[PDB]
Amino acid sequence: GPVPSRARVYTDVNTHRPSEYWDYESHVVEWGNQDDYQLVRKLGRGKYSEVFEAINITNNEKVVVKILKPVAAAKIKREIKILENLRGGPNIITLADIVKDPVSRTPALVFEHVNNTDFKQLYQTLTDYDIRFYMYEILKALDYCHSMGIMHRDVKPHNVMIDHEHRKLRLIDWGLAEFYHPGQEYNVRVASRYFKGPELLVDYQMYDYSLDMWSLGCMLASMIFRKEPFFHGHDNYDQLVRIAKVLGTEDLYDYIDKYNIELDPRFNDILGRHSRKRWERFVHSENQHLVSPEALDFLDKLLRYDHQSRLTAREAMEHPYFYTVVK
Numbered sequence: 001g002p003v004p005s006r007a008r009v010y011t012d013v014n015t016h017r018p019s020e021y022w023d024y025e026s027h028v029v030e031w032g033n034q035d036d037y038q039l040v041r042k043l044g045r046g047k048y049s050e051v052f053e054a055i056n057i058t059n060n061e062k063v064v065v066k067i068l069k070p071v072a073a074a075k076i077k078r079e080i081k082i083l084e085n086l087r088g089g090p091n092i093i094t095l096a097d098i099v100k101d102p103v104s105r106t107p108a109l110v111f112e113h114v115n116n117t118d119f120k121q122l123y124q125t126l127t128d129y130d131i132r133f134y135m136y137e138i139l140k141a142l143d144y145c146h147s148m149g150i151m152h153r154d155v156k157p158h159n160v161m162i163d164h165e166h167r168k169l170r171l172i173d174w175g176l177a178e179f180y181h182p183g184q185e186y187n188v189r190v191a192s193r194y195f196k197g198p199e200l201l202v203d204y205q206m207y208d209y210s211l212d213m214w215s216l217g218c219m220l221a222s223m224i225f226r227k228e229p230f231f232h233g234h235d236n237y238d239q240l241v242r243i244a245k246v247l248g249t250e251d252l253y254d255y256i257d258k259y260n261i262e263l264d265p266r267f268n269d270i271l272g273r274h275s276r277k278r279w280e281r282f283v284h285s286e287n288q289h290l291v292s293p294e295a296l297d298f299l300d301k302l303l304r305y306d307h308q309s310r311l312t313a314r315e316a317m318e319h320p321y322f323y324t325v326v327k
C-alpha cells in the first residue's frame with residue numbers, strides 16, 4: 001500500500017510534551033462568565049459556528065464571539081486546546097475566554113477583536129513590499145504553530161486578518177487545526193478547494209505541517225500574479241488537473257510513484273499530459289510590479305507536489321525574497 005511519511009522538522013514535539021498538551025479529549029475547560037459579553041452584531045455564519053462582534057463590558061473593549069453549533073464535541077475540545085497551547089504566540093489570534101452561550105447552550109469562544117481591512121481591498125492594494133512584509137508575518141505564525149506540534153490545515157485569505165493601519169496580522173480559525181503525530185493518518189477533507197495540497201487531492205493521509213506551506217504558496221501565487229485563486233478547479237478532481245497544467249504531470253506521477261499512491265482511476269480520463277510551465281509564463285503588464293526573481297524562486301520552492309520537498313516555515317523565512325523586509 002502507500003509508503004509512510006514523516007515531517008522533516010518538529011517530528012517528535014508532541015511525544016516529548018506531557019499527554020495533557022495534545023490529549024485534547026481529557027482537557028477540562030475553564031468556563032468564563034457569559035454576562036461579561038454583550039453581543040453587538042452578527043458578522044457571519046459558517047458550517048460550525050455563528051460569529052458576532054461583541055463588547056466585553058468589564059473593560060469596554062471589542063471582542064469576537066464564535067458560538068459553536070451543537071455538533072462534534074471532540075472537534076470543539078481540539079480547537080480550544082490548540083488555541084490555549086498557542087496563546088501569546090506571534091500573530092496567533094488570542095482566545096480571550098470560553099463561555100456557555102445562554103441561548104444555544106453550546107460553547108462560545110471569545111477572541112480578541114481585529115479591526116481587519118476588507119479582503120478584496122487587501123488583495124487589490126498590497127504593494128510588492130507589503131506582500132513580502134505580510135508573508136513574513138504569516139510565516140512567524142506558521143513556524144510558531146508547527147514548532148508547537150500543530151498544523152493549521154485551513155490557511156487561506158479569509159483566515160488571515162490584517163489590520164493594515166497598524167500593520168498587524170493574525171492567523172485565525174483553528175477549528176480544522178490538528179496535533180501532528182508521526183505516522184498518523186489524517187482526514188484529507190480539510191482546507192478549502194483552491195488551497196488543498198496535492199497530498200489531499202490524491203488521498204495521501206500521512207501528511208504534516210508542509211500542507212500549510214502549499215496553502216501559503218497558493219496565496220503567494222495569487223498575490224504576485226493577480227489571479228484569484230491561482231489554481232481554479234471546478235471541483236476536487238479538476239483542482240489537481242489545474243495544478244498539473246502548471247507543475248506538469250511527470251513530477252505528479254513521480255510523487256505518486258514515490259509514496260506508492262493508488263491514484264483514483266477517475267483521473268485517467270482528465271489529467272492528460274502536461275509539462276511544467278516556467279513561472280515567467282504567468283507574468284504580464286498588470287502584475288510585473290509584484291514579480292521579482294526572488295519572488296519566483298521562493299514560490300517555486302513552496303509549490304512542489306512532494307510535501308517533503310517544500311521549504312519549511314523557518315527555511316522560508318531565510319529566503320532572499322525577505323531580505324528587503326525591515327527586521
Ligand SMILES: Nc1ncnc2c1ncn2[C@@H]1O[C@H](COP(=O)(O)OP(=O)(O)OP(=O)(O)O)[C@@H](O)[C@H]1O
Nearest residue numbers: 043044045046051064111112113114115116158172
Ligand atoms: N477576531 C476577529 N476579529 C474580527 N473579525 C473577525 C474575527 N474572527 C472572525 N471575524 C470575522 O467574522 C466573520 C465570520 O463569518 P464567516 O466565517 O461566515 O466568514 P468568512 O470569512 O467568509 O468565512 P469562510 O470564507 O472561511 O467560510 C468574518 O467576516 C471574519 O472576518
